[PDB]
Swiss-Prot record:
It comes from Gallus gallus. The active site is at residues 35, 52. GO terms for biological process: cell wall macromolecule catabolic process; defense response to bacterium; defense response to Gram-negative bacterium; defense response to Gram-positive bacterium; killing of cells of another organism. InterPro entries: Glyco_hydro_22, Glyco_hydro_22_CS, Glyco_hydro_22_lys, Lysozyme-like_dom_sf. Belongs to the glycosyl hydrolase 22 family. It holds the Pfam family Lys. In the egg white and polymorphonuclear leukocytes. This is Lysozyme C. Residues 1-129 form the C-type lysozyme domain. It catalyses: Hydrolysis of (1->4)-beta-linkages between N-acetylmuramic acid and N-acetyl-D-glucosamine residues in a peptidoglycan and between N-acetyl-D-glucosamine residues in chitodextrins. The lineage of its organism: Eukaryota, Metazoa, Chordata, Craniata, Vertebrata. Its main location: secreted.
Amino acid sequence: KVFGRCELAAAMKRHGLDNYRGYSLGNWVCAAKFESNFNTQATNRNTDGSTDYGILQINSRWWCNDGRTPGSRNLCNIPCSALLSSDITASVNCAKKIVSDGNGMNAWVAWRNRCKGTDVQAWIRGCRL
Ligand SMILES: [Cl-]
Ligand code: NA
């Protein structure tokens, strides 16, 4: 599913991401925009053989099991395919664990390079939340 900007903002808010670990909603929407272009079905292979999945591009090296990333962890205890669902619940629950991991949202390269320090509130402007 390809979310609309405000549709995703509302879904994320409902799932408790607004201000989760101190990150306002705009940060999460911005991260999703640049990581997957709001597409829940996005996948991208990494050079180490792991693959990023879903709207937040969660990595199989540590957070989910895809059966093809030797010596990887499954810290979120879910098959990576669960992260591609039109229902973002799994992605959000796993993202909460990732952002609590110690490096905050810096875990998302696109957030660090394209959202961090920018006017992230603009990502939720105009939305009825
Ligand atoms: Cl932090
Ligand atoms: Na894994």
